[PDB]
Every structure is written in structure tokens, then in C-alpha cells.
Design a protein around this nucleic acid. Structure first.
Lengths: 68, 108, 45, 91, 81
DNA sequence: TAGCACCGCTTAAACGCACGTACGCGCTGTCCCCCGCGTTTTAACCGCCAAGGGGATTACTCCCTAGTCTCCAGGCACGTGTCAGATATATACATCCTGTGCA
DNA sequence: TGCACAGGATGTATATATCTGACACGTGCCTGGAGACTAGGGAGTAATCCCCTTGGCGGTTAAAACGCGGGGGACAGCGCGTACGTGCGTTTAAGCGGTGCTA
């Protein structure tokens, strides 16, 4: 809630939130992050390493196309 | 005096009249064929029944009488055609199907 | 599996038997005699 | 007043499994899913008609749309159920 | 409000990755994860806030969040849709 | 009336730090397969020989269809009552204390 | 002298009951179906004109295929060094419910 409050306050003055909105934002964040993490896991596996590394996430993003 | 709903005439539980009104209000076309709302009601009822059956099977196998989002996620992710249908959809508090890559396990 | 209610049922079961007569003595041997006849412990014990 | 499919979902569920209960969260999930898939089919129908330049959305258009959206086996079952509904309506 | 990018902590990233089944992790992962989360949140929040401001509004409702996510193609069920 | 703010106990999730160990990287030799290249084989078009078939576009002509206003009377939604469950606390002894009469 | 038990003390798993959630049954309003009017978009009808294969055929060509050398790319081993895993003691502020305002 602190992070979302800060980001919204940076984006727009004097905003308010619904509690349900903040909860939905948390749920969506967790879903996206778990998807990203599993993609990173598959990437690291392909590298033949168990230690996931930032490049694995970057690759996941590129193949997904969030930064291509 | 007495009358019977168009849903009963079609033999559908979903409110075909409400579907017809929602279609009309959605302004999707200037003219709406009377067969469109019934057809929509039928397909929607079939999909609802299928998903509900899957959820109920999940509930029974979990041995819990009340469907919670976990059960819905299990059902949706299991049925591969629905899984591919809804791949961009996330279910609140649904969680994920357990999955471990073989090479991560020490053995067996 | 055994309780004082089992003792009460035995007291009710006492009505069938009629012959035996009591006596008195005290020693630690008699204390152990009471102890075996008051085990109330199962084969698991 | 506000109206939702929740009651109809509850009805169909009870038809499927009498002894089974359902949470409000799952009820809302199902209501949102049916609303979404209705919207999807309606948009597909609209787009098709627009290309065909047909002013009337008939059951036939919705049928083809349903084949488009749904996987082949699910599409076949959907079309079969819709046609059965049409036949019962014809009575 | 300050430094809240740190507020996510390492252990939260740990638990989330644990859900992802990762057996082995690297220290650098946390910063990258935070950056990714930051840009994701920024985009979702901007979309939601513009959805709100349309309606001559001041409170971001769950409808604004869910429809903003729908516009990003991420579809979310169970919050009154 | 749902969000905001301050109170103020209660943990427990974060954190610093300690030890190690198994994992990632650097470098090894191996060997097999896939590039650079040359020779043979196949697919494709030109011109032969000029079309008929049938398909998509276009228009006219009803007529049927559900867009429209309207009444009838309802069945569906909003709410309260009832029934159940999870929580709460007496009890019938349970697990024992302890003066003192007995061996 | 030390033991046996007569007389008495905290407790508690067992048992009886009180403190919270969810579903079904009652009201009652924005309705959904129905009756009749309506017309112009859909559908049935009829060209009509244009684009699609005929069909295999030889004489060619450009691309495909096949063969070969080899050399360097992939990759299985592994020495080793460390930076994440597991396990403490310790702190914070995340969670809980509560009181007062309001936008």
C-alpha cells in the first residue's frame, strides 16, 4: 500500500483509493510476478544453471516482448 | 392471463430476455434477430454448466463442499482446451497448479 | 476404556453372585493385591 | 436495483450437484466469466456483421462466432446445444 | 513516503519466487525484480488513474483497476465484474 | 458510508551474522557434425494451342421481421429470520497435597 | 522410625452451553411477455462479364539436392572459490481491534 500510494501521489495529486482497488492491485502484481518468475526459472534451466540471474529475467522479458 | 417465459420455452435457465435487452442496449446492431438471444442463452448455459461441473469435481476430490477460488483455478487450468482459452486470465486467489522441473529434484 | 461407571456396572453385576464373604488384613502385599485388581490399563500400556 | 446472473448460476449449480455449496467469491467469479464471454461473443458477431454489411445479427452469425471463439470440440458442443435450443423454440 | 521500493524487502521476493518453484536464487535478482514491479505498477496505475479522471472522480475504484488491466490485456476475475 | 487518521498491544517477519558446501566459472581435451564448395538432378516457365465454366458482382421485388408504444402482472432482487457452527466454560472427577494414626 | 491413609487441594479432559455466519423465506417494483402497428433490410430472383484451369508437352534454366573435407563448436570433466542456503539472537512495524471525523 505504501508503494502504490507513493506511485499514485507522484502521478496525481490528492488521489484516493478504494481498499478493494488496492487489494486487486496486489493480486494482479503477485500474479504477474509469479508468471515472470516461472519464465525466469525455465530460462535458467535452459542455461543449465540452478541459480537464476538477472539476464534470465531480461531474456524472459524479451521473449515475452515487454522490452523487445 | 397465464404466460411462460421465453427461457422455459427454449428450455434454458439463464434469462434470455435479459440477454436480449443487454444485446439491444449494447447497440451492436440496428436489428437483432430473435434467434440471437436464445442462441446466446444456450451457449452461455452450456459453458456455465461445464465450468461448474469441473469445479464440483475439484471440490469432491478436495473433499470440500464449498467452491473457493482454488477449486476454480484447478478446474480451469486442468482442462487443457479451457486452459488455452483463458491463458491471459488470472483468477483471484486461485493460485497455481503444483509443478516441479525434474532436473531440480535430487533424484526420483 | 474403563471408568468408575464400569465399576458401577460390576456392582450391578454383583447381584448375580451371592456366596463370597469378606475379611480384613493389611500389609504392603495386600496393597499390591489391591493394585493389580485396580489396574485399569490396556494391552497397549 | 442491481441484477446479476448469480441467481441463475446458483440454480444451475444446484441442478448439477445438490449437496454442494458455493462461496460468494466463486459466485462473483462465475458471474464475471459469463458476462465477459457474452461480451466477447457479441463483439465477434458485431465485427462479422460489419464486414458482411448485414444489419441483423441472426442466430447463424452468433453460431459462426461461437465456432470462432471456442476450441473446436467446445465449439461443436456449444453449437449443438444452441441448435437444440433453436429446435425447442421452433415448437 | 520514501525508499518504499526497498519496502518490498528481500523475503517477499523470496516467498514469491518460492511459489515459482525456484530452487536457487541470486542476490542481484531482488533489484531487477523491484525494477520490473516498479514499471508494471507505474503503467497499471497510470491507466487506472486516467480511467478514474474521466468520470469527474477522486477515488480510484476497483472497476478502474480491473478495466485498466483489461486494457493491458491482463484479465482479472472475481472483483465484481 | 467508506476512507482516513491516530492509539497502542502482539507478535513474527526482517534483519545481522555466523558457518560451509555445493554450485558456477575457467580451463581442459575430444570428436562429430554442419559450413564452404563441386557436381547432378528436379521444378518451373515459354510457347504450343484459345478456349468454356462457373463464379462474384449487381440489381429489382416483395414481405416479413422485430423497432415501436403500450398494458398486464410478475419474478426477481433486497432484506429479515431462522438454523448451524465455531467458540466458550462448568464438571465429575483428575492429578495430587498433607497431617497422623498404624506397623 | 518410617509407613499407610484419613482428610483435604488445586486443576482439566470431559462435557454442557454461549457467542458469530450463512442460507431460505417474505415483500414489493421496475420490470419481461405479450398485442398490435409498422417498413425497409433481408432474402429470393437474374443476369453478366471476367477470371480461372485446359492438360501434357520439349526445350530449356535457376534452385534443390546430394557428396565430400575438415576444423572448430559443442560438451562432458573437473579444480576451486566463493556467495547463497540453514540456523540462530534480536528488532520492527505489520496486524489486530478500537474512536473520532468526513468528503
Amino acid at each position: 500500500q505504501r508503494l502504490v500510494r507513493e506511485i499514485a501521489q507522484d502521478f496525481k495529486t490528492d488521489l484516493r483509493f478504494q481498499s478493494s482497488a488496492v487489494m486487486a492491485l496486489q493480486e494482479a502484481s503477485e500474479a504477474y510476478l509469479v508468471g515472470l518468475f516461472e519464465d525466469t526459472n525455465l530460462c535458467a534451466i535452459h542455461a543449465k544453471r540452478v541459480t537464476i540471474m538477472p539476464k534470465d529475467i531480461q531474456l524472459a522479458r524479451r521473449i515475452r516482448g515487454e522490452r523487445a | 392471463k397465464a404466460s411462460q417465459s421465453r427461457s422455459a420455452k427454449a428450455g434454458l435457465t439463464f434469462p434470455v430476455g435479459r440477454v436480449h435487452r443487454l444485446l439491444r442496449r449494447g447497440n451492436y446492431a440496428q436489428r437483432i434477430g430473435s434467434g440471437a438471444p436464445v442462441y446466446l442463452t444456450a451457449v452461455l448455459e452450456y459453458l456455465a454448466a461445464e465450468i461448474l461441473e469441473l469445479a464440483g469435481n475439484a471440490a469432491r476430490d478436495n473433499k470440500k463442499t464449498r467452491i473457493i477460488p482454488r477449486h476454480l483455478q484447478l478446474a480451469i487450468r486442468n482442462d487443457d482446451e479451457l486452459n488455452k482459452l483463458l491463458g491471459n486470465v488470472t483468477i483471484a486467489q486461485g493460485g497455481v497448479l503444483p509443478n516441479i522441473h525434474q532436473n531440480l529434484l535430487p533424484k526420483k | 476404556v474403563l471408568k468408575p461407571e464400569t465399576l458401577r456396572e460390576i456392582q450391578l453385576s454383583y447381584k448375580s453372585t451371592k456366596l463370597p464373604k469378606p475379611k480384613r488384613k493389611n500389609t504392603n502385599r495386600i496393597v499390591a493385591l489391591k493394585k493389580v485388581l485396580s489396574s485399569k490399563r490396556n494391552l497397549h500400556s | 436495483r442491481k441484477e446479476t446472473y448469480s441467481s441463475y448460476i446458483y440454480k444451475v449449480l444446484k441442478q448439477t450437484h445438490p449437496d454442494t455449496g458455493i462461496s460468494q467469491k466463486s459466485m462473483s467469479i462465475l458471474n464475471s466469466f459469463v458476462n465477459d464471454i457474452f461480451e466477447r461473443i457479441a463483439t465477434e458477431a458485431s465485427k462479422l456483421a460489419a464486414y458482411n454489411k448485414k444489419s441483423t445479427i441472426s442466430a447463424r452469425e452468433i453460431q459462426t462466432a461461437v465456432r470462432l471463439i471456442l476450441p473446436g470440440e467446445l465449439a461443436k458442443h456449444a453449437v449443438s446445444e444452441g441448435t437444440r435450443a433453436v429446435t425447442k423454440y421452433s415448437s | 513516503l520514501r525508499d518504499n521500493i526497498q519496502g518490498i524487502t528481500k523475503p517477499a521476493i523470496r516467498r514469491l519466487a518460492r511459489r515459482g518453484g525456484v530452487k536457487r536464487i541470486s542476490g542481484l535478482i531482488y533489484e531487477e525484480t523491484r525494477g520490473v514491479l516498479k514499471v508494471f505498477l507505474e503503467n497499471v496505475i497510470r491507466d487506472a488513474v486516467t480511467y478514474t479522471e474521466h468520470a469527474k472522480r477522486k477515488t480510484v475504484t476497483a472497476m478502474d483497476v480491473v478495466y485498466a488491466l483489461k486494457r493491458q490485456g491482463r484479465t482479472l476475475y472475481g472483483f465484481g465484474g
